[PDB]
Write a protein that binds this ligand. Sequence first.
Ligand code: NI
Length: 341
Amino acid sequence: TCPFYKKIPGTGFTVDAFQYGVVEGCTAYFLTHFHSDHYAGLSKHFTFPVYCSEITGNLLKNKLHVQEQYIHPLPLDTECIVNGVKVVLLDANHCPGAVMILFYLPNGTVILHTGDFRADPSMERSLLADQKVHMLYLDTTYCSPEYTFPSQQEVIRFAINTAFEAVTLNPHALVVCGTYSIGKEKVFLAIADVLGSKVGMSQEKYKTLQCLNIPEINSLITTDMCSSLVHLLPMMQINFKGLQSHLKKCGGKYNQILAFRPTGWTHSNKFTRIADVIPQTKGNISIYGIPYSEHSSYLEMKRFVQWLKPQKIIPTVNVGTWKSRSTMEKYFREWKLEAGY
Ligand code: NI
């Protein structure tokens, strides 16, 4: 049964609530982004309206085979009307197509739903800057001071060079990149841009990136693995038994795999800095874990909320233990006392 934190009071609306059958009183279902925890329950046999970004709507049509008549895409940064209620979609800085939703309730209340997001100062000069917010449905995926990780530009700086060094020394070395969903497209588009290669991947994965509206995507990706030296592989496959296995299927073309597993947070971020990162080696196979987060760090979140000054906050993530819920309100209170709202 749908939790309270996936319902927008005063509307017929829900957010990323597709796995509970038909919700009672829901006239519109909002999907924030195309990650399976959020769209779980959608298929070609869904028959209620779906609202989402243009890009998320490509993925529903093509990957899930949801019917064109139920998908309502909306432009970003644009004041839209939806069953008489003003809504705005803003970019979440999460994965491609991912939005935050502003709801302007008839009664005069205003509600921001972050979705999954990575807080950025650029968000402080968006449509949010002009008015007050009463309820914040917040992505608390990293709501604890231990959660520090570097900026995305830093990780992509390291990733390029680490890769670009390896192949200028040994031009018969492969660059694999691990993936299971959307998101994290820079990691691989960046490395492959520098090396000169298109990115090679499966037909399935090739179908997925074709939906994301990337400029000139044709020029950047291929299914032709023989004609590619920056490959993509399922994240599960990025171990020693899986990379070996793949190294055979190259057919005498590459004599070394230099992988990347983009991870979110890992307890090694609490101690080791990004520039000091190294690989797990078992011969010619070197697997890099790098901290590429598509979620806010503790300080990014804090700054975002202390700017927004919302009257009530509602965590959408790590809600399932009284220890996590307990710990989160303490930070929210400290943030409110610090900033004097
Ligand atoms: Ni997500």
